[PDB]
Amino acid sequence: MENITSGFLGPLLVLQAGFFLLTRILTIPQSLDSWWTSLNFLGGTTVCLGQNSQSPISNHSPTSCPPTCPGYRWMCLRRFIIFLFILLLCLIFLLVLLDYQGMLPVCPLIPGSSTTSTGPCRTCTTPAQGTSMYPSCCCTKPSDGNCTCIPIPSSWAFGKFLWEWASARFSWLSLLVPFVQWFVGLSPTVWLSVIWMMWYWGPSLYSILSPFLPLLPIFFCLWVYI
Amino acid sequence: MENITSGFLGPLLVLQAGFFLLTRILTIPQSLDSWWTSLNFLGGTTVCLGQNSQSPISNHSPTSCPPTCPGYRWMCLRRFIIFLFILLLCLIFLLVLLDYQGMLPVCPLIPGSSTTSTGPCRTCTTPAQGTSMYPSCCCTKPSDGNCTCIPIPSSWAFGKFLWEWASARFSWLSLLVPFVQWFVGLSPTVWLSVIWMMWYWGPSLYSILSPFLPLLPIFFCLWVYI
C-alpha cells in the first residue's frame, strides 16, 4: 500500500537534493570567477585570444573560451586558487559560530585580583618569578596546591581575549580604542552616511593626501622624540 | 660627539625604513591584481578597452592605464578588497604562530582516569549528562568533591583543539583521516612528483570523474543500506 511509498520517497528526495546541492556548490567557483568579469567586462568587448584558432576557430567569447581547444588549460588554475578560498571563508564562519554559541572554550590567564568564590584565598598566589603572567591553571604558581583561577566567560571569545593580548603587546591600540568607541557609536543615520560619502568622494582627496601621507612619518618621529 | 650622531643616524634609519615599508605596502595591492592578469594572458590580449579617448586619447592600454582618466573607480575598490584579503592571510599566519606558541590554550575536556601527576580521586563520582564540556570543574558540583581537572596541556594548540569538535560532529570519514595519515608520508621527494602528475593529467580524468560522480550518491545510499 502507501507504506512502501514512505521508504521509497526518501530516496527520491535524497537524490534530488544531492544532485542540486552538489551541482550548485561546484559551479559557484566558476560563477565567482565570471563575477570578477566585472573587471573583465569593465573594459568591455571581452573576446579571449585563448580561444585561438588552433583546433577550432570560432571565437568562444572570453569567459569559458573553448572547453578544451587552444587556451583552456587555466580554468583548473583559477579553480585551484578559488575553491580553497571558499573553504577559508567557511572556516571564518565556523570561528564566528564558536564565539556566538558560547560553547567554544576561552579559558583565560592574565594578571588580576578579581575574586568570586566561596571562602577563598588566605593562601592565594605568591609567585615572584615569570613576572605577572599565569600558566595553565592546574596550579599555576610554583608551589600552589589549593589554587583555583578563573572560568571561561559567557561573553566575547578569544576575540576579546586577544584584544587584551594585543593591548598588552602594543600601545597604540589603546589610543585607537577611543576611535573604536566612536565608530561603535554609529547608528544607521551615521553608518550609512559614511558608506554613501565613501563613493565618488574619497579618491579625489586621496591624490592630495598622498603627499600628506608621505609626511606622517616625520610627525610620528617628532612626537616620539618629544 | 656621538649622542647627536646616534640620534641622527637613528633618524636616517627611521626615514629609510618607514618610507620603504609604506612604499612596499602601496606596491602589494596593485601587485596581486596585476598578477591576476594571468586571466588576460590566459585570455590573450592585455589592454584597457575602457580607456575613454574623450579626455585621454592614450591607447597605451595594458591596464592600470589612467589613475584619473576614463574608468578608475573600480581600480581602487579592488585594491581595497585584495588588501583586506592579504590581511586575512596574515591573520591566518598569526593564528598559525599562536598554534606554535604552545601557550595557546584549548582548555578541552574528555572522560578518562589519567592524571599528569599524583592525583587523589577520593571517590570522584559526580557525573552529568554530556560528560564532555562539563561544568567549569572548579569543584562546581553538589559538593566540592575533591576535584582536579585539566590545565591547558602543551600540544598543537590548533589541531588538538579543533579535532575534538571535528570528531564530535564527524568521524563519518575518520577512516579517510587514517588514509590521510597513511598518505601523509609522501612529503619528501614524492610531493613534487604528485604535483607534477596532477599538472600534466589533471583535465583528462575530469570527464571520467564527472560521469562517476552521479553514481557516487548511489554507492553512498548503498552504504546507508549496508
Curated annotation (Swiss-Prot), chains A, B:
Residues in the Virion surface compartment per record: 101-174, 225-226
Main location: virion
Superkingdom of the organism of origin: Viruses
Transmembrane keyword on record: yes
Record keywords: Acetylation, Caveolin-mediated endocytosis of virus by host, Fusion of virus membrane with host endosomal membrane, Fusion of virus membrane with host membrane, Glycoprotein, Host-virus interaction, Lipoprotein, Membrane, Myristate, Transmembrane, Transmembrane helix, Viral attachment to host cell, Viral envelope protein, Viral penetration into host cytoplasm, Virion, Virus endocytosis by host, Virus entry into host cell
Glycosylation site list: N146
Biotechnology: Systematic vaccination of individuals at risk of exposure to the virus has been the main method of controlling the morbidity and mortality associated with hepatitis B. The first hepatitis B vaccine was manufactured by the purification and inactivation of HBsAg obtained from the plasma of chronic hepatitis B virus carriers. The vaccine is now produced by recombinant DNA techniques and expression of the S isoform in yeast cells. The pre-S region do not seem to induce strong enough antigenic response.
Record-level GO cellular component terms: membrane; viral envelope; virion membrane
Listed name of the protein: Large envelope protein
Source species: Hepatitis B virus genotype C subtype ayw (isolate China/Tibet127/2002)
Shown residues within the full chain: 175 to 400 of 400
